[PDB]
Design a protein around this ligand. Structure first.
Ligand SMILES: [Zn+2]
Ligand SMILES: [Zn+2]
Ligand SMILES: [Zn+2]
Lengths: 128, 103, 730, 57, 280, 192, 57, 69, 124
DNA sequence: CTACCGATAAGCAGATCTCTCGATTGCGTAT
DNA sequence: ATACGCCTCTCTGCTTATCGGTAG
RNA sequence: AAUCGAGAG
């Protein structure tokens, strides 16, 4: 039951995997322009005047296309019939800067109840 | 330090599957990759079906990448390879039902 | 609206005649639109009717309830519509179904009502009525419970269990209780009709979505695969299910088993296949707050609940107190109206179907297209939905065929007495736990807890029988009546670092579970979860990011040894309790809720804001008290029982009810002749406009032992002052 | 009652001439026994009477 | 205390007092330390109260073996805390606990069908006796030299599906009793009241304290329960203990009731030679 | 209801000794070293165990209550009747507390010297699941005021937190009298 | 000062003779219907304890 | 409702001073204390009777059964 | 595959039957209908210890590091007042107030001597 | 050996001070 | 319109089932 | 006359 609106990829690009190259899985938010991704740390990078967190983090398998460019074969280089687990994995997450509290302004000593003004003798002895 | 980027590959080149823990597959399994960056995968064999699809709720915000990192260099071979959840059905008992209504 | 969502989700109830595998003809009646109007009178052309007339005639104040059926035949061959009025629906004053909806003070006075009238109450049979605000378990949150009655339910039942209350967009409630059995099996309990039902949890898990068993193992047990307690419990569960139901080898077989099991109680149609009726029970019972087409989300939620139950029974998490405000929310009173209206129209559809079935079983002159037949059958049922609602208001009895998750039948509407404006305004701020707890002997439910700081008034509570039960609202405590727009928060959370649920393969209280409205979003570490909660609060306070409304409730629960179950919980729904607070960074008003308060430091005044301990502060300490409990002068110098007795006796004075007394016909009305404003008063005396309804008189009071006629509690009144009108009333 | 839970029934309507009079000529309209306070402990009524006299002045 | 106690005494005349207690005078020569030793020797100790942890090592690879290694507190700790010896503990384990455990296991199965072993041949005869007398045991060895542990294999068959075998052990370990005087769960030595030395035990069993004449003045043994006193001491002693009990409630609330009233109440209650009550 | 300048000085000097009673009580209940800081991670760990376990919570709420009640008794004895600016027989409040006409030395001490620790049942004020006794107090607070030790007096009014604790205590009293009125007798009918 | 609504004209009642119950020939209930007040079980027990027997009868 | 004819405590006729108090408050920028002193109210028993009067009768009067609205 | 005491199918994830409950040398996946030898599953071990709150004992209380036991001697009930003792005359006489019989009735104080142990619960 | 008994386990019946006001008391069939 | 037929959380005792001990 | 609600001691 092929879904409507879905077109099979009749051809696919290659995947040049043969100290040999390691395979990394890296996440990005939508708020990152992956096109002009100039560089990535190993960590509080600045991208488009915006800061992101970078840290390190197997169920997920790798689907590398075979020599047909019509489907995917499971990656394996050590010949163990087991997926080639990523040699290192990194993650990218948003960060924000929380303002430090100005205790110098927010620690207000208590103001005493303000004395009324214009207070004079409203009571006098009888006959005065 | 920081790591350089060679070329982000926006065209579908790699895919990522998440079947379950400790999953291994026969050497004669292949998967059908459809596009609409959402994908809906399908792989078949004698007794099983690899019926899978992406989650549109998660993909519209997060985007993944698979990359090859040179040790002898300072460059990364980045690729746009999304992750698809996969439910492995069995041909043995996929079409096994019962009567419509009990009298 | 809520009513239209309810009539939508009600569904269609069908009947057959069998008249020639031809099951017969199909008639699927349903209502798709409900409309109300401000009441009018035929005194030809309708003239607006104002509540002054209803009050003066000693009658009710009700509009017209419009119901359009859908007399559809055989999957839409021919569609018949009929807009049928269903009696008079009482409406509350100062609501959009009332003529006083936006009248200025001048217009209100012109139309004989009041200068600063507040509605919120109904007029039925010339007696004013109001719908109390019950307090119920927090919606869409699974809370671990230890209860002796759970084990008393039968053999092998234990105290442990997880109870969740899920709420539909209709604002109707469904309870899903995950019991625990000492052998190893988990028993999902629910209740469709007045009777209850028990289902093995793996059966419902598999009916939800096509899953393996290794996926259940991974979803209940995370990377904690060395925890023998968990491995053995889950192995017992899985093997017990695989034993008792060996033939149910796929989702369809499980669903057909459920549909076979649930036929007569669910009133399933003879047309409906067992598979689709099983999907119907699954989507009409299990975790209704995710709605239909959310099976993957329901599956993740049930795995979360199961792992939480095993955490509870291993003693790795503390029980959740069901009678603490940290885990509560309030039934507004209009939502009770909506739910009861949905129930009444459901019974109305059932009544018309019963009439057509009686026509089937007595004669045969029946035809679905026969409009004469449709008119003759509709006009032989009782379409007094509005009169049923008037009965509900005037009696307080919840005549229900099924009964909602409410634990009580009676005690829902009380008269709004007009002895005194303190009393009148107090009716609209009181919360009752329920008559169930009214007749009980557990004192601890009547306590005062540090979880009600700013939400329930510590002072305002009657003594006597209702002490601790009937406790009022803090005057700055707001109840949300609209759903916050959370459409974008999942998108923000993923950017923040909340790794998506669907492809993360993790569980357990060793990581934070990010959830929104009882719907798992993702999984993240505890340090990063604390950072995410901080960032959410910051971006919510600075209203720049358009994904975070101010009403968002960021409940972060850090990892605590045998404490509450950890995880980051976000809320946006109806019936929450909210109160303002000053977020120290950016120094602007924040909104907090009882769930998230108990884990954050909120300095009471700015003078004792400590370093690196506090992030919030009250605007003022006086907003933790009710209106009555705030109008008492120098109440921090009195002893607390004396403040409580003042809160009680301020509602019993002979003050002034109102000024429009020439246009009312109340049974008994106490009025003070000459009131005065107090010389010494709280600031909030003026803000709530109490000077429109003076309650007492300033008097010169001598603290003297002179008379001998005032020793225990008596007091002496000057005779001359009494002859001069001191304390006079009619 | 006052606004401090100091209820009590009117025992007798004392004649004005029999009421104690002050140096300013005023006779209180309410007499409250001093023994109401030591057990109830409503010091708020004391400070309120103080402030009410000052405000009326 | 209070109205619950007066309901028990006057409105119910329950034989089963909610909290039975015994007052046991001590001879004026028995020292306080010896009195505490007597308390330890009289008070009940369960097998649970001496076990630190129990490690159950299942191994289904067709006999489902169920090796159990129950760890004990250090002997210098638990002997001094409970007056329990290694030999007494070993006898309790070998006799009572294993039979209780296997009874629980067979009940569960019936419901379910719906450091070193360098033996000295004494331990070997003991193991053979345990194996013969027991329905599942196959291994057994006790730390006779140090009194710190006990391990035994409870071998089973593959017919049976999974057992918890840890909750079972916990429940049985709570059930089993090392030593116990009937009806007594604890003997606590409070401070003297009115200068008289008294031991108070948590259950009433008169005929069991008569053995320890050297410690307890059995002439002065009076107890909280009235039915027990009426059984073993007659009507008049029951009337006296009724009066003392109904006077103890008011005294602890510093409420004085004339002893004539309590005496009349007691005489009406015991007018038939029995412990009547004020009810239907 | 007033004191002298030196009476208020005595009161404040003795109450300044109540800045460490709660912390020392906690430091000895957790079997820790004395003079241990109130932010010690080991102290917080042991305090969390005390919070989890009801019996250990009772031990803490008894020891701390003992020490703070000792401080209260010191204040009362030192400042009455030697601190009042008006003295018996002139002082009418003290006069009717002494004569038994109405009131007690407890009430007089509460109006003039100290309100003292509020006890709910036998323990101090309830503690939330987070280790917080109130939103205003940080988790696992070794402060007497946090645990319900009201150092204010009805003459000079009590702080918002102490007001909340005092409301807890008053509500407890009214709940107790509610229970008494509900289940009262029938013992007298059965006897008579 | 606030005037509470529990005035004493709604509290006092006196009956010498008047309407009686149907089958018992005893005073009716209720202040507003001219009925007598009840001498209950505890009043009877207290009236016996005085030794007042003609009074109790 | 409306200004009392006499002071409750002493009996000094304060019923003829409400309009004058209002005028002294509105036209002149007098304080309430200054206005009451200039009105002839010396005892605070008499001062309170005009200082604290609310005059609810004006609000009562807007509901007139005998005039079309 | 096999995890502790459980075996899951490698190809569909269904829970395999316990080997010692079926025939020799081969077990069958119910879903995949595959074959798994009874080799490579030599032992299904699960080592479980007790709850560490299972056995509440006086030694388990003393096993902890916090203070668990409160002596009668070490409890000084506090609340010392200078009331006069009706028995002996020692100055100390502890107290406690408990409102009774109404929300308005007078208070009562449980006066208790410290020397002779005399008790006095007097309202006024 | 055999009644014959019996120690459990299980089912079942009843209470839990005086006073004053108001508001409301139900619904399906068939001549 | 109007007369017939009808619908979820205590706590003492006294009294009985049930599948096995128990003297002759 | 039963219940429901409100209250007084
Ligand atoms: Zn005057
Ligand atoms: Zn398989
Ligand atoms: Zn003494």
């Amino acid at each position: 039951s092929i879904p409507d609106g879905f077109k099979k990829c009749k051809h696919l690009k290659n995947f040049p995997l043969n100290k040999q190259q390691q395979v990394w899985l890296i996440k990005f938010p939508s708020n990152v322009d992956i096109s002009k991704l100039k560089s990535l740390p190993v960590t509080t990078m600045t991208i488009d005047k915006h800061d992101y967190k970078i840290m390190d983090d197997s169920n997920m398998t790798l689907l590398v296309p075979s020599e047909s460019k019509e489907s995917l074969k499971i990656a394996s280089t050590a010949k163990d019939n087991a997926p080639l687990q990523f040699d290192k994995v990194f993650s990218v997450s948003e960060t924000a800067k929380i303002p430090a509290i100005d205790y110098s302004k927010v620690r207000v000593p208590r103001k005493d109840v303000p004395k009324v003004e214009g207070l004079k003798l409203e009571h006098f002895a009888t006959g005065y | 330090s920081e790591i350089e980027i060679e070329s982000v590959q926006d065209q579908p080149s790699v895919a990522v599957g998440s079947f379950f823990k400790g999953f291994r597959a026969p050497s004669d399994t292949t998967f059908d990759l459809y596009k609409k960056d959402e994908f809906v995968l399908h792989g078949e064999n004698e007794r099983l079906e690899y019926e899978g699809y992406t989650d549109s709720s998660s993909q519209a915000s997060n985007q993944y990448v698979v990359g090859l990192f040179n040790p002898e260099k300072k460059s990364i071979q980045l690729y746009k390879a999304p992750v698809l959840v996969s439910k492995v059905v069995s041909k043995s008992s996929k079409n096994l039902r019962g009567p419509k209504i009990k009298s | 609206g809520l009513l239209n969502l309810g009539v939508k989700d009600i569904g269609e109830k069908v009947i057959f005649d069998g008249k020639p595998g031809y099951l017969g003809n199909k008639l699927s009646v349903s209502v798709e639109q409900v409309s109300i109007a401000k009441p009018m009178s035929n005194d030809a052309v309708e003239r607006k009717v104002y509540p002054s007339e209803s009050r003066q005639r000693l009658t009710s104040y009700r509009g017209k309830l419009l119901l359009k059926l859908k007399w559809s035949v055989n999957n839409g061959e021919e569609n018949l519509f009929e807009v049928r009025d269903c009696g008079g629906l009482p409406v509350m004053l100062q609501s959009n179904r009332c003529h006083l909806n936006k009248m200025s003070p001048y217009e209100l006075v012109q139309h004989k009502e009041e200068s600063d009238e507040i509605g919120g109450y109904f007029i039925v049979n010339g007696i004013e009525k109001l719908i109390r605000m019950l307090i119920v378990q927090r919606r869409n949150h699974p809370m671990a419970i230890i209860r002796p009655s759970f084990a008393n339910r039968g053999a092998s039942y234990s105290h442990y269990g997880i109870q969740i209350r899920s709420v539909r967009p209709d604002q109707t409630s469904q309870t899903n209780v995950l019991h625990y059995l000492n052998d190893g099996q988990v028993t999902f309990r629910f209740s469709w009709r007045k009777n209850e039902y028990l289902v093995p949890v793996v059966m419902i898990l598999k009916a939800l979505c096509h899953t393996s068993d290794r996926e259940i193992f991974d979803g209940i047990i995370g990377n904690d695969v060395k925890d023998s307690f968990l491995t053995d419990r889950l192995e017992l569960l899985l093997r017990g299910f695989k034993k008792r139901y060996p033939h149910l080898q796929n989702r369809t077989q499980v669903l057909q088993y459920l549909g076979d099991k649930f036929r007569v109680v669910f009133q399933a149609s003879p047309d409906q296949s067992d598979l689709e009726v099983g999907q119907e029970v699954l989507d009409r019972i299990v975790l209704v707050h995710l709605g239909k087409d959310g099976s993957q989300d329901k599956f993740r939620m049930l795995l979360f609940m199961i792992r939480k139950l095993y955490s509870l029974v291993a003693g790795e998490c503390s029980p959740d107190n069901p009678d603490a405000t940290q885990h509560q929310e309030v039934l507004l009173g209009g939502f009770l109206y909506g739910m009861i209206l949905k129930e009444k129209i459901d019974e109305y559809l059932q009544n018309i179907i019963a009439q057509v079935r009686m026509d089937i079983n007595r004669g045969m002159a029946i035809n679905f297209k026969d409009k004469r037949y449709m008119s003759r059958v509709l006009m032989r049922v009782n379409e007094n939905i509005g009169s049923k609602m008037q009965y509900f208001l005037s009696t307080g009895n919840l005549v229900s065929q099924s009964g909602l998750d409410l634990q009580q039948v009676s005690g829902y509407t009380v008269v709004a007495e007009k002895i005194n404006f303190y009393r009148f305004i107090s009716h609209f701020r009181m919360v009752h736990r329920g008559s169930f707890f009214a007749q009980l002997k557990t004192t601890t439910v009547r306590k005062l807890l540090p979880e009600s700081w700013g939400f329930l008034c510590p002072v305002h509570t009657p003594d006597g029988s209702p002490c601790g039960l009937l406790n009022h609202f803090a005057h700055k405590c707001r109840i949300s009546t609209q759903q916050s727009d959370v459409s974008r928060i999942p998108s923000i959370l993923y950017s923040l670092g909340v790794a998506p649920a669907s492809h993360t393969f993790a569980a357990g209280p060793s990581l934070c579970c990010v959830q929104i409205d009882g719907k798992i979003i993702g999984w993240v570490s505890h340090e990063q979860g604390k950072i995410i909660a901080d960032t959410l609060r910051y971006w919510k306070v600075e209203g720049k990011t358009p994904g975070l409304p101010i009403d968002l409730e960021i409940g972060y629960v850090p990892p605590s040894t045998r404490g509450q179950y950890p995880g980051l919980y976000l809320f946006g729904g109806h019936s929450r309790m909210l109160r303002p607070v000053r977020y120290l960074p950016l120094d602007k008003e924040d909104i907090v809720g009882p769930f998230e308060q108990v884990y954050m430091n909120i300095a009471v005044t700015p003078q004792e804001i400590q370093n690196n301990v506090h992030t919030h502060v009250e605007f003022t300490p006086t907003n933790i008290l009710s209106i009555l409990a705030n109008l008492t002068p120098f109440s921090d110098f009195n002893q607390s029982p004396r403040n409580m007795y003042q809160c009680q006796m301020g509602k019993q004075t002979m003050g002034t009810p109102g000024v429009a007394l020439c246009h009312r016909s109340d049974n008994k009305l106490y009025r003070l002749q000459t009131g005065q404003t107090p010389i010494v008063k709280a600031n909030l005396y003026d803000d709530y406009g109490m000077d429109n309804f003076p309650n007492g008189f300033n008097a010169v009071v001598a603290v003297i032992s002179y008379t001998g006629y005032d020793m225990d509690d008596a007091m002496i009144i000057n005779k001359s002052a009494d002859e001069r009108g001191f304390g006079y009333g009619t | 009652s006052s606004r401090h839970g100091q209820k009590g029934v009117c025992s007798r309507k004392w004649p004005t001439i029999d009421m104690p009079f002050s140096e300013t000529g005023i006779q209180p309209d309410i007499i409250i026994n001093p023994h109401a306070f030591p057990s109830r402990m409503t010091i708020g009524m004391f400070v309120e009477s103080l402030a009410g006299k000052a405000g009326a002045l | 205390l209070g109205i619950p106690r007066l309901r028990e005494i006057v409105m119910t005349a329950s034989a089963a007092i909610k909290t039975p207690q015994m007052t046991l005078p001590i001879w004026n020569d028995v020292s306080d330390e010896q009195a505490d030793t007597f308390c330890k020797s009289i008070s009940k100790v369960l097998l649970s109260e001496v076990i630190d942890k129990v490690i159950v090592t299942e191994t289904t690879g067709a006999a489902r073996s169920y090796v159990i290694h129950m760890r004990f507190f250090d002997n210098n700790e638990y002997s001094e805390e409970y007056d329990v010896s290694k030999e007494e503990l070993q006898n309790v384990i070998s006799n009572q606990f294993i039979h209780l455990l296997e009874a629980a296991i067979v009940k569960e199965i019936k419901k379910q069908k719906r450091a070193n072993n360098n033996m000295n041949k004494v331990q070997r005869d003991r193991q053979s006796a345990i194996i013969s007398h027991h329905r599942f045991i196959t291994k057994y060895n006790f730390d006779d030299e140090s009194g710190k542990w006990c391990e035994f294999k409870l071998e089973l068959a593959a017919d049976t599906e999974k057992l918890l075998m840890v909750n079972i052990v916990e429940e049985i370990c709570r059930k089993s009793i090392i030593r116990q005087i009937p009806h007594i769960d604890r003997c606590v030595h409070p401070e003297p009241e009115n200068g008289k030395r008294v031991l108070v035990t948590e259950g009433v069993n008169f005929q069991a304290m008569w053995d320890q004449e050297a410690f307890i003045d059995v002439d002065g043994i009076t107890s909280n329960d009235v039915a027990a006193v009426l059984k073993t001491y007659g009507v008049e002693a029951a009337r006296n203990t009724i009066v003392n009990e109904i006077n103890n409630v008011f005294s602890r609330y510093a409420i004085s009731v004339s002893f004539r009233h309590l005496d009349l109440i007691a005489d009406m209650m015991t007018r038939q030679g029995t412990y009547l009550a004020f009810n239907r | 209801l007033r004191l002298t300048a030196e009476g208020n000085k005595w009161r404040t000097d003795i109450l300044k000794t109540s800045v460490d009673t709660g912390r020392e009580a906690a430091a000895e209940v957790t079997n820790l070293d004395k003079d241990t800081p109130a932010d010690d991670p080991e102290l917080l760990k042991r305090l969390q165990e005390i919070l989890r376990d009801n019996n250990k919570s009772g031990i803490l709420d008894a020891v701390t209550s003992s020490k703070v009640n000792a401080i209260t008794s010191q204040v009362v004895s030192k400042c009455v009747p030697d601190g009042t600016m008006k003295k018996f027989p002139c002082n009418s409040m003290q006069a009717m507390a002494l004569s038994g006409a109405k009131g007690s030395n407890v009430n007089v001490s509460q109006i003039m010297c100290l309100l003292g620790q509020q006890a709910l049942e036998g323990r101090r004020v309830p503690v939330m699941v987070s280790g917080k006794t109130l939103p205003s107090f940080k988790p696992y607070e070794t402060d007497a005021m946090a645990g319900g030790y009201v150092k204010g007096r009805f003459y000079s009014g009590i702080k918002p937190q102490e007001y909340y604790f005092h409301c807890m205590a008053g509500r407890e009293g009214l709940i107790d009298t509610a229970v008494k009125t509900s289940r009262s007798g029938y013992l007298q009918r059965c006897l008579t | 000062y606030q005037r509470l609504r529990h005035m004493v004209n709604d509290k006092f009642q006196v009956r010498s003779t008047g309407p009686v119950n149907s089958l018992t020939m005893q005073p009716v209930k209720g202040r507003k219907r001219h009925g007598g007040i009840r001498v209950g079980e505890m009043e009877r027990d207290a009236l016996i304890g005085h030794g007042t027997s003609f009074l109790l009868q | 409702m409306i200004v009392p004819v006499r002071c409750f405590s002493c009996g000094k006729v304060v019923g003829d001073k409400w309009e004058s108090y209002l005028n002294l408050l509105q036209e002149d920028e007098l304080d309430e204390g200054t206005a009451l002193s200039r009105l002839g109210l010396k005892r605070y028993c008499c001062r309170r009777m005009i200082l604290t009067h609310v005059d609810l009768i004006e609000k009562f009067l807007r509901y007139n059964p005998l005039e079309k609205r | 595959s096999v995890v502790g005491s459980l075996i899951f199918c490698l190809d569909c994830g269904d829970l395999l039957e316990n080997p010692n409950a079926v025939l020799g040398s081969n077990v069958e996946c119910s879903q995949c209908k595959a074959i798994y030898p009874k080799s490579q599953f030599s032992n299904l071990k699960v080592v479980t210890t007790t709850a560490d709150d299972a056995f509440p004992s006086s030694l388990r209380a003393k096993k902890s590091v916090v203070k668990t036991s409160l002596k009668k001697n070490e409890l000084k009930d506090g609340a010392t007042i200078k009331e006069k003792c009706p028995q002996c005359g020692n100055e100390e006489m502890n107290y406690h107030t408990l409102q009774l019989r109404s929300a308005d009735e007078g208070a009562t104080v449980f006066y208790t001597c410290t020397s002779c142990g005399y008790k006095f619960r007097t309202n006024n």
